[PDB]
Amino acid sequence: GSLNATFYAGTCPNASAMVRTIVQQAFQSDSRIGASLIRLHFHDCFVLGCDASILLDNSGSIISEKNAGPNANSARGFNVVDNIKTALENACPGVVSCTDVLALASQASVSLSGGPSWTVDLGRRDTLTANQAGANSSIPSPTQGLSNITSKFSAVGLNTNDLVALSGAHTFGRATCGVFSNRLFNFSGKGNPDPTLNTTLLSTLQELCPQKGRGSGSTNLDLSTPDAFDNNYFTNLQSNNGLLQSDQELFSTTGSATIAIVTSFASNQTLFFQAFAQSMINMGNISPLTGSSGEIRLDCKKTNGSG
């Protein structure tokens, strides 16, 4: 419905700088926050479009996406999002959508982490509903395999190029034992660890995530540069060092078109950065609410009139 770069030009011209300022503050105490923030945009877009559905808390009317499988005890940064919103509301009351906040924060997070900048498209509007069931089914799982994951991307209009570049977001941030422990001991019922997992990594992960353990351990998505936004994620894959089954599958899946793309990104960081920016824009374009559909939420946690 034609999101555009200049949507707030009249009404909140400095929105981008303001978001960036808050995200930078946030980074001061939490190295992980930029990663968590971009993930929220991803999880937002993949369920009923980039409509801030994910942000909504439980109520009598709302069964929160926060409780969905991919989100529960995993998704994070909601308080920081509130802090960004509070700044915007103070400068430009009633203007900037939560859906837009997520898009803007994503760019700030990458740029602040040494990554590329891109021109965020704006004009999204905030949903009055959540779709927990959609979150359970629409969002890719790390263990469902590349074909299913690729279908899930297609399903929202994102192609293989998009999939590989976007997977590059795993260049920063963290993962809990449970999302990758299937690799560790009895992979795919084989009785052995995933052979595509670098044995050096395997050994440390095994210690981190003991087989009859509680699963509290957490580690870096990118063992090379856990916080910098760079192409090391791709180089890692070349060395069997991708963390998630879904990560490594991009390189190790015999005959996958993904392999050449990863190699290309591994060779040329600039190329990866350019592709990542375009892909972020593409993801950001998924099924927006626009015009007078939806609302501008005053508090991202709640529909207007609920708090």
Ligand X SMILES: *[C@@H]1O[C@H](CO)[C@@H](O[C@@H]2O[C@H](CO)[C@@H](O)[C@H](O)[C@H]2NC(C)=O)[C@H](O)[C@H]1NC(C)=O
Ligand Y SMILES: *[C@@H]1O[C@H](CO)[C@@H](O[C@@H]2O[C@H](CO)[C@@H](O[C@H]3O[C@H](CO)[C@@H](O)[C@H](O)[C@@H]3O)[C@H](O)[C@H]2NC(C)=O)[C@H](O[C@H]2O[C@@H](C)[C@@H](O)[C@@H](O)[C@@H]2O)[C@H]1NC(C)=O
Ligand Z SMILES: CC(=O)N[C@@H]1[C@@H](O)[C@H](O)[C@@H](CO)O[C@H]1O
Ligand U SMILES: *[C@@H]1O[C@H](CO)[C@@H](O[C@@H]2O[C@H](CO)[C@@H](O[C@H]3O[C@H](CO)[C@@H](O)[C@H](O)[C@@H]3O)[C@H](O)[C@H]2NC(C)=O)[C@H](O[C@@H]2O[C@@H](C)[C@@H](O)[C@@H](O)[C@@H]2O)[C@H]1NC(C)=O
Ligand V SMILES: *[C@@H]1O[C@H](CO)[C@@H](O[C@@H]2O[C@H](CO)[C@@H](OC3O[C@H](CO)[C@@H](O)[C@H](O)[C@@H]3O)[C@H](O)[C@H]2NC(C)=O)[C@H](O[C@@H]2O[C@@H](C)[C@@H](O)[C@@H](O)[C@@H]2O)[C@H]1NC(C)=O
Ligand W SMILES: *[C@@H]1O[C@H](CO)[C@@H](O[C@H]2O[C@H](CO)[C@@H](O[C@@H]3O[C@H](CO)[C@@H](O)[C@H](O[C@@H]4O[C@H](CO)[C@@H](O)[C@H](O)[C@@H]4O)[C@@H]3O[C@@H]3OC[C@@H](O)[C@H](O)[C@H]3O)[C@H](O)[C@H]2NC(C)=O)[C@H](O[C@H]2O[C@@H](C)[C@@H](O)[C@@H](O)[C@@H]2O)[C@H]1NC(C)=O
Q: Is residue 170 flagged as an active site residue?
A: no
Among 3, 7, 12, 18, binds ligand X (CB under 6 A): 18
Interaction of residue 268 with ligand U, rule CB under 6 A: yes
Rounded distance between C-alpha atoms, residue 144 and residue 157, angstroms: 19
Which of the choices ligand X, Ca ion, ligand Z, none does residue 144 contact, using the CB cut-off of 5 to 8 A by kind? ligand Z
> What's the min distance (Å) between Cβ of 169 and ligand X?
24
What tokens does 48 get? 């009923």
Strand, coil or helix: what is 27? Answer: helix
**Is the Cβ–Cβ distance between 301 and 57 less than 8 Å?**
yes
Q: Which two tokens stand for residue 53?
A: 């559905």
Q: How far is the CB of 90 from ligand X (least distance, A)?
A: 11
Query: Considering all CA atoms of the chain, what is the largest pairwise distance in Å, rounded to the nearest integer?
Result: 62
Of the residues 43, 76, 124, 125, only one is catalytic, namely 43
Return the HEC string of 9-53: CCCCCCHHHHHHHHHHHHHHHCCCHHHHHHHHHHHHHCCCCCCCH
Contacting ligand Y (CB under 6 A), which of 6, 86, 192, 200?
200
Stretch that binds ligand W, among 119-127, 133-141, 183-191, 265-273 (CB under 6 A): 183-191
Q: Does 154 bind ligand Z (CB under 6 A)?
A: no
Among ligand V, ligand U, Ca ion, none, residue 44 binds (CB under 5-8 Å by kind): Ca ion
Q: At closest approach, how far in Å is the CB of 127 from ligand HEM?
A: 20
> Is the Cβ–Cβ distance between 53 and 296 less than 8 Å?
no
Catalytic amino acids? 43
